[PDB]
Structure 1
Amino acid sequence: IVEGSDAEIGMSPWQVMLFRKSPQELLCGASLISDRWVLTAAHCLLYPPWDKNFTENDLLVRIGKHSRTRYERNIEKISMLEKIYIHPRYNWRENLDRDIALMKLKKPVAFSDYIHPVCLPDRETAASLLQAGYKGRVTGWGNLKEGQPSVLQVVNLPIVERPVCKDSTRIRITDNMFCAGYKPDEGKRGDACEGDSGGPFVMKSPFNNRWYQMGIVSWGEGCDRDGKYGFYTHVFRLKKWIQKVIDQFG
């Protein structure tokens, strides 16, 4: 996260760390949607161009974390994956279209002051909130500059209109994506950065006061460059697939 600030304890109880057993190292962010399901970006598990291709055995899921490197004895819970599910139509070849994957935990985690799932938007919630100018919040342990924080970082960023998004890049933008960030204008900065991948973009409903995850950190070009924006997987657009997965697989 670029130009963010340290999160408060218990601020994003759904923040998950995707952790590599060997070498032991942060892979990506992710989020808890229930006691047995974690949501992340598919490009965090499979990215052929870079020879990335994780399996269940390869990874560890760390929940209730604050410190990046410390093992938070009695706070954090570490779990095992039972199964990874990647979008059948994830497009890693061209523009990370449909960049989403579910991870099924070996056992259900227990909720605590520091552990708690985020809500998934409903068609209605998506409609009123996914609007240019509305701010969302991104969190993560990723790079501070295009180096690594000692604690979880946070930043609030506005959603940008589809045309500004498209016109900021040469990569083809699809309906499964949205971009967020300030304009060179707005004279406020911030972005996600390398290592933030798979983290949640969330918004707080003004109607029921609940936190909803609307996007997943997907991709960008550099971090916090003027005239460039962060791109997120549009979660309500892939809601159907997620449903399908959860009730067909537990």
Structure 2
Amino acid sequence: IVEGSDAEIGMSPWQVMLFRKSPQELLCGASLISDRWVLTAAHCLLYPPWDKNFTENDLLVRIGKHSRTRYERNIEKISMLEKIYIHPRYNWRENLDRDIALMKLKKPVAFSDYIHPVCLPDRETAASLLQAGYKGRVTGWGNLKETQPSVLQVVNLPIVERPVCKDSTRIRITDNMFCAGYKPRGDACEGASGGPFVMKSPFNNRWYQMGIVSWGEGCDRDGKYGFYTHVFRLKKWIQKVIDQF
């Protein structure tokens, strides 16, 4: 993440890393929602322009990693994939509308102090928290290229009003997206795509994934804001899949 700081231990235990098997490559972030399930962006599993059209065997995920460089044995775990589900109306061509996808683990992760899932938002919590000026937290990783090992980073960013979002780009944005980040600094950089934007309920005191990181417009460029897939709008779909396994 650009313009962040060090996360604490087990601060974002639902944080996941989406890796490639061969060659080993950090693709994206993802969010643990249950024992058998992980949530991420559709562009992380399918993007014909960058020549991306993965399958379950191509990929492998690393749960509850504090520091990415190490192999933190008996803290973290590593898991295979059984099936990948991308949104049927995921429009990659035009705007990344419905940039959402689900990955079913081959085996279920057992919850620990460092592995623990996140709540999906419901009609109340969505309308009450998804407001301009209200801030949300994005977790991700600073890439290895330049830079106390590489420990999980974290930033807090304010949701932006819908007509500041529509003026900040030339791209037809739907109601399935919202947008966040400071005005004229911070934007979750490559490696941190498809991971969670969370908010904490002052009412019930749980953590709730409001948005998945869909795109920046560059990693932290003022006047431009990162766009996040509106998880509640598409909440309906997530259920259809997890019911039907």
Query: How does the TM-score come out when normalised to structure 2?
Result: 0.97
Shift of 1:143: 4.2
Going from structure 1 to structure 2, the CA distance change for 1:124 and 1:144 (only over 3 Å counts) comes to: farther
Per-residue Cα deviation, 1:112-144 (whole angstroms, up to 9, x for no partner): 010000000010000100000000000011449
The answer to whether the Cα contact below 8 Å between 2:69 and 2:149 also exists between their aligned partners in 1 is no
Rounded Cα–Cα distance in structure 2 between residues aligned with 1:22 and 1:215: 29
Going from structure 1 to structure 2, the CA distance change for 1:218 and 1:145 (only over 3 Å counts) comes to: farther
The answer to whether the Cα contact below 8 Å between 1:41 and 1:100 also exists between their aligned partners in 2 is yes
The answer to whether the Cα contact below 8 Å between 2:59 and 2:81 also exists between their aligned partners in 1 is yes
Shift of 1:232: 0.4
**Correspondence for 1:32:** 32
Rounded Cα–Cα distance in structure 2 between residues aligned with 1:225 and 1:15: 25
Shift >3 Å, 4+ stretches = 142-149
Shift of 1:68: 1.6
Rounded Cα–Cα distance in structure 2 between residues aligned with 1:149 and 1:166: 39
Rounded Cα–Cα distance in structure 2 between residues aligned with 1:2 and 1:148: 17
Rounded Cα–Cα distance in structure 2 between residues aligned with 1:218 and 1:91: 12
Shift of 1:145: 10
Shift of 1:65: 0.3
**Correspondence for 2:60:** 60
Rounded Cα–Cα distance in structure 1 between residues aligned with 2:180 and 2:130: 11
SS in 2 for 1:42: coil
Shift of 1:24: 0.8
Shift of 1:25: 1.5
Q: Structure 1: which 5+ residue stretches go unaligned?
A: none
Per-residue Cα deviation, 1:160-191 (whole angstroms, up to 9, x for no partner): 0000001011111111111101110xxxx211
The answer to whether the Cα contact below 8 Å between 1:203 and 1:214 also exists between their aligned partners in 2 is yes
Rounded Cα–Cα distance in structure 1 between residues aligned with 2:240 and 2:133: 32
Shift of 1:157: 0.2
The answer to whether the Cα contact below 8 Å between 2:142 and 2:150 also exists between their aligned partners in 1 is no
Going from structure 1 to structure 2, the CA distance change for 1:200 and 1:169 (only over 3 Å counts) comes to: same
Query: How does the TM-score come out when normalised to structure 1?
Result: 0.95
The answer to whether the Cα contact below 8 Å between 1:143 and 1:149 also exists between their aligned partners in 2 is no
Shift of 1:53: 1.0
SS in 2 for 1:43: coil
Shift of 1:224: 1.2
Rounded Cα–Cα distance in structure 2 between residues aligned with 1:43 and 1:172: 17
The alignment-based identity, stated in percent, is: 99
The answer to whether the Cα contact below 8 Å between 1:42 and 1:86 also exists between their aligned partners in 2 is yes
Shift of 1:102: 0.5
RMSD: 1.7
How many pairs were matched up? 245
Going from structure 1 to structure 2, the CA distance change for 1:230 and 1:86 (only over 3 Å counts) comes to: same
Per-residue Cα deviation, 1:78-131 (whole angstroms, up to 9, x for no partner): 011100000000010011110000001111110001000000001000010000
Rounded Cα–Cα distance in structure 2 between residues aligned with 1:70 and 1:24: 14
Greater alpha carbon shift after TM alignment, 220-229 vs 34-43: 220-229
Going from structure 1 to structure 2, the CA distance change for 1:201 and 1:228 (only over 3 Å counts) comes to: same
Greater alpha carbon shift after TM alignment, 136-145 vs 82-91: 136-145
User: For 1:161-240, what aligned pairs fall within 5 Å after superposition?
Assistant: 161-184=161-184, 189-240=185-236
Going from structure 1 to structure 2, the CA distance change for 1:211 and 1:194 (only over 3 Å counts) comes to: same
Rounded Cα–Cα distance in structure 2 between residues aligned with 1:170 and 1:227: 13
Going from structure 1 to structure 2, the CA distance change for 1:144 and 1:74 (only over 3 Å counts) comes to: closer
Per-residue Cα deviation, 1:6-44 (whole angstroms, up to 9, x for no partner): 110110010000011111121100010000100000100
Going from structure 1 to structure 2, the CA distance change for 1:135 and 1:23 (only over 3 Å counts) comes to: same
Q: Structure 2: which 5+ residue stretches go unaligned?
A: none
Rounded Cα–Cα distance in structure 2 between residues aligned with 1:193 and 1:106: 29
